[PDB]
Design an enzyme around this catalytic site. Structure first.
Site, mmCIF file in Angstrom:
data_model
loop_
_atom_site.group_PDB
_atom_site.id
_atom_site.type_symbol
_atom_site.label_atom_id
_atom_site.label_comp_id
_atom_site.label_asym_id
_atom_site.label_seq_id
_atom_site.Cartn_x
_atom_site.Cartn_y
_atom_site.Cartn_z
ATOM 1 N N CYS A 77 3.343 1.685 9.384
ATOM 2 C CA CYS A 77 3.218 0.573 8.442
ATOM 3 C C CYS A 77 4.567 0.090 7.983
ATOM 4 C CB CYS A 77 2.312 0.938 7.276
ATOM 5 S SG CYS A 77 0.625 1.322 7.789
ATOM 6 N N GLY A 102 2.173 6.061 9.759
ATOM 7 C CA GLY A 102 3.600 6.008 9.479
ATOM 8 C C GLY A 102 4.262 4.740 9.995
ATOM 9 N N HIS A 125 0.819 -1.215 0.000
ATOM 10 C CA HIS A 125 0.000 0.000 0.000
ATOM 11 C C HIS A 125 0.861 1.278 0.000
ATOM 12 C CE1 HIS A 125 -0.296 -0.147 4.584
ATOM 13 N NE2 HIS A 125 0.078 1.114 4.379
#
Ligand code: LV9
Ligand code: LV9
EC number: 3.4.19.12
Lengths: 304, 304
Positions: free
Chosen positions: B145, B143, B41
């Site tokens: 991820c 942030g 993503h």
């Protein structure tokens, strides 16, 4: 979102851990620059720990009696000195992995991460608070002595604790990195009273603000209180008295949530008087006091 | 003595964290050998996250569009591929800090440490369990991820989790390192049902054994039960059914304490039916299920 008992990343500290052996005793040391720091009780035998004369015991030791090993490499000891309850072993090689660091004496109620070690090898990391009575509720077994507590501000490691012993009550005592014990403790195998402990009120309020930020709001009520009224409740429930300095440090969290500090005190008052009625806050069924207002801001803002 | 929610020392993992930027999105990546792994993503925009066609989005990207930075040095991307929900960016330089590692798919109920990161920088470490419903109750902000979960066996890091998203309920979902989600989740900004969660019965029993080892014994009773009787109680209280495999894994703790597993089940049964009556176990006012039987043995034996 989510709120966890988070420790600092331990990498910078793992690179400083060494094993120190003297006679038949092995414990952990901290290698910073060309000095290895460790609990002076590494020079004690089993008959000695009951009432040791560290000055006399250290006189029977020479530089070559302190075996310091960093991983699999042996360090050469060129000096030894005792400073309070720590031994400082000068080595001929500066630790190449020495981070930027400071030695700090933390205040009761402040938090830090512990890197539990055995034989100079890191086993785990956890976050804890220095209790108001200067003990820590850690997880340490035989061989963990010399494991350290620390905080990290960007690239600087502030070492604040070195583990020395477990009291007969199962709680832990240690020193700052200048070898001064936190609390009234001495490095002797004798019964030692830890004072009456109290709950760290400012930390519980900080954690209640963390709960509100994360959606746990059931405990918020329609009431307010005063510092005097709240402190009558805090005294009854063995909580530390809240001061204006504590209110001031809660300022950013009060500002972020729009909940006045004295209103949060009134929620805490009702929680103390009525309990949690079988409910939880941030996955806990008790009031948590191991997060400072700084920890809550850091965790909620993602400081790296 | 003492029992803490202990994470693995994170050093070996800190050396693998990098920042990955694609377009205007920045998240964390894991650099092992000459490959950087990150959530796919990272290639999404704000209009895209609602229903992304990752295949089409990735086609508009070239090696030079993935900006990978390790500390302050830029890595050169020479290949990119999508495997399930992870992107694998081949770089021209093998990570010099690559530890010995494996990629593993953990089972529900197993535990691991998470190194929460932002902009490729480690912020903290905590231990958690993969819930029976394949979510994790972490502490992650925007942030985070690409932050990973792992276990360590001496010098080998077994990476088991990569963080992908927070569900509208505030719980966390992610993948193994081959990019396969744990649970039914998809990497799309859509409401997604996490299944009914249950308490990890074998872990609660392991933690009750840890309590006995550390002196918390008030909950031990004069009763016993059967697997069938205990499981009728477990069903009622939304606990996982206990199997003989779970009894078998509790064997070492049963042997160390001399408390038969079914006798510990009878203590757990009484604790479920009566509650804790305002008492605590290992500093907790609820039954803790984030320690596996292996964690209890490791912590109680000092494995480094
Ligand atoms: O405190 C620990 N063990 C330990 C275990 C678990 C957690 N922390 C520490 N070890 C002793 C240390 C000592 C104290 C004072 C003088 C000389 C040595 C005290 C008990 O007897 C063995 C040495
Ligand atoms: O999940 C997070 N944030 C986050 C915050 C806190 C904890 N964990 C993660 N971010 C989004 C990720 C996403 C999901 C599916 C497709 C494309 C991107 C979802 C929400 O909108 C922003 C992107």
């Amino acid at each position: 979102s989510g709120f966890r008992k988070m420790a600092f990343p331990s990498g910078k500290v793992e690179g400083c851990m060494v094993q120190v052996t003297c006679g038949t005793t092995t414990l952990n040391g901290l290698w910073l620059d060309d000095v290895v720091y460790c609990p002076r009780h590494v020079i004690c035998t089993s008959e000695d720990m009951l009432n040791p004369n560290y000055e006399d015991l250290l006189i029977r030791k020479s530089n070559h009696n302190f075996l310091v090993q960093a991983g699999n490499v042996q360090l050469r000891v060129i000096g030894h000195s005792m400073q309070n309850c720590v031994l400082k072993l000068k080595v001929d090689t500066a630790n190449p992995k020495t981070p930027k660091y400071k030695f700090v004496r933390i205040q009761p109620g402040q938090t830090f991460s512990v890197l539990a070690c055995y034989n100079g090898s890191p086993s785990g990391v956890y976050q804890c608070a220095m209790r108001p009575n200067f003990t820590i509720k850690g997880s340490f077994l035989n061989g963990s002595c010399g494991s350290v507590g620390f905080n990290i501000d960007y690239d600087c490691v502030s070492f604040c604790y070195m583990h020395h012993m477990e009291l007969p009550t199962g709680v832990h005592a240690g020193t700052d990195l200048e070898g001064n014990f936190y609390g009234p403790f001495v490095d002797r195998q004798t019964a030692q009273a830890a004072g009456t402990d109290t709950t760290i009120t400012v930390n519980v309020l900080a954690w209640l603000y963390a709960a509100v930020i994360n959606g746990d709001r059931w405990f918020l009520n329609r009431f307010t209180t005063t510092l005097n009224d709240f402190n009558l409740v805090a005294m009854k429930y063995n909580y530390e008295p809240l001061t204006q300095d504590h209110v001031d440090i809660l300022g950013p969290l009060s500002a972020q949530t729009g909940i006045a500090v004295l209103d949060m005190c009134a929620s805490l008052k009702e929680l103390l008087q009525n309990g949690m009625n079988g409910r939880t806050i941030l996955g806990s069924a008790l009031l948590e006091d191991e997060f400072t207002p700084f920890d809550v801001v850091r965790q909620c803002s993602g400081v790296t």
